[PDB]
Design a binder for this molecule. Structure first.
Ligand SMILES: Cc1cn([C@H]2C[C@H](O)[C@@H](COP(=O)(O)OP(=O)(O)OP(=O)(O)O)O2)c(=O)[nH]c1=O
Ligand SMILES: [Ca+2]
Ligand SMILES: [Ca+2]
Ligand SMILES: [Ca+2]
Ligand code: NA
Ligand code: NA
Length: 328
DNA sequence: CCGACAGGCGCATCAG
DNA sequence: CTGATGCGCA
DNA sequence: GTCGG
């Protein structure tokens, strides 16, 4: 991953992870990621802090840190953070799926600071954590698109075995066209589940159950009526190493709200934050279901009509961006 | 110079 | 039990 | 940490 301002964006990303995991300051995390991201799309080699301060999201303090990074090749503030035992122990435990900043601090206080520690205090972990630990190495591996293509095929073919009326669409980075993905995201619709009625129950469960039967889904992290979060694995063949286990998310979204749903799930996460914050500036709030006007006194009005992804962009006066131009 | 920062699902836990 | 909140997650 | 009203 060698890149134009890679030094700088790496440094800001690290600082965002610190603020999230150690400081627990969600808005500093966001503001660092917004700055990283804006710098990543800037097509000159940045030469000074002052030059970077021109970009939206970059202010006084990131500017000063860029000056230092460029002059000296590193940042003191990060040099200190990396030596701090506590800080890096908390950062590390957060890499386990299901451990966030709070739980990572509470383990480090109790003396649980390493993977060997996690692996001998099984009893201290809830179900999700336990599976996140079981598949720790596997979930930090990326998924080549060619494997995403096989996993897609399995998911869509089994969904079809349950009910030809389902539509399953693979989203996230896959739909943006990335050559590798962190995990699989499937958006599910069925004619029976619309914003005005649920004419059938068990619509998600039945899909989960079928994918368990053919051994594709192997564990469940959480499961509700519209959202499944778990683990899957491709079948392997005689004499080969098994495929690593992979994180999978499935979201059943009412069929009439497909476009807001797939906007949401196509992301990126940062792009969604930007696009939703722009909507607010303009008098609208967008979620995975609707786009709605904002009333003088904070009150969200009625859902606007939407019949394309592009409709949502028009409302807030954005030129349409193709999924592949929503990355970073 | 200060409020607002994206939006919501599922699980865990607490007061009543 | 319900309802409220915080956590970790997409 | 940054920014618009
Ligand atoms: C993490 C996250 C995701 N999302 C949305 C947009 C994401 O593209 C989508 C799925 O989340 P992810 O699977 O975390 O993201 P991704 O598919 O874009 O990236 P990767 O290749 O690393 O797996 O959910 C949010 O809206 N907010 C969030 O905080
Ligand atoms: Ca984690
Ligand atoms: Ca993904
Ligand atoms: Ca995901
Ligand atoms: Na700026
Ligand atoms: Na196996």
């Amino acid at each position: 991953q060698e890149t134009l301002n890679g030094g700088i964006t790496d440094m800001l990303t690290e600082l965002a992870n610190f603020e999230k995991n150690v400081s627990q300051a969600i808005h500093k995390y966001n503001a660092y990621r917004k700055a990283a991201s804006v710098i990543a799309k800037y097509p000159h080699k940045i030469k000074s802090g002052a030059e970077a301060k021109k970009l939206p999201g970059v202010g006084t303090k990131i500017a000063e840190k860029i000056d230092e990074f460029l002059a000296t090749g590193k940042l003191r503030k990060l040099e200190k953070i990396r030596q701090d035992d506590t800080s890096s122990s908390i950062n590390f435990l957060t890499r386990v799926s299901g451990i966030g900043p709070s739980a990572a601090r509470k383990f480090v206080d109790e003396g649980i600071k390493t993977l060997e520690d996690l692996r001998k205090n099984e009893d201290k972990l809830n179900h999700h954590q336990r599976i996140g630990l079981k598949y720790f190495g596997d979930f930090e591996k990326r998924i080549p698109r060619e494997e995403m293509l096989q996993m897609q095929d399995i998911v869509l073919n089994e969904v079809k075995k349950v009910d030809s009326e389902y539509i399953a669409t693979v989203c996230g980075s896959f739909r943006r066209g990335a050559e590798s993905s962190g995990d699989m995201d499937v958006l599910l619709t069925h004619p029976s589940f619309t914003s005005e009625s649920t004419k059938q129950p068990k619509l998600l469960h039945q899909v989960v159950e079928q994918l368990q039967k053919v051994h594709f889904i192997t564990d469940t992290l959480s499961k509700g009526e519209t959202k499944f979060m778990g683990v899957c694995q491709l079948p392997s063949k005689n004499d080969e190493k098994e495929y690593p286990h992979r994180r999978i998310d499935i979201r059943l979204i009412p069929k009439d709200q497909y476009y807001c749903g797939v906007l949401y799930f196509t992301g990126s996460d940062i792009f969604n934050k930007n696009m939703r914050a722009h909507a607010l500036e303009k008098g609208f709030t967008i979620n995975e279901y609707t786009i709605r006007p904002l009333g003088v006194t904070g009150v969200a009005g009625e859902p606007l009509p939407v019949d394309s992804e592009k409709d949502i962009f028009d409302y807030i006066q954005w030129k349409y961006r193709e999924p592949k131009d929503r990355s970073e």
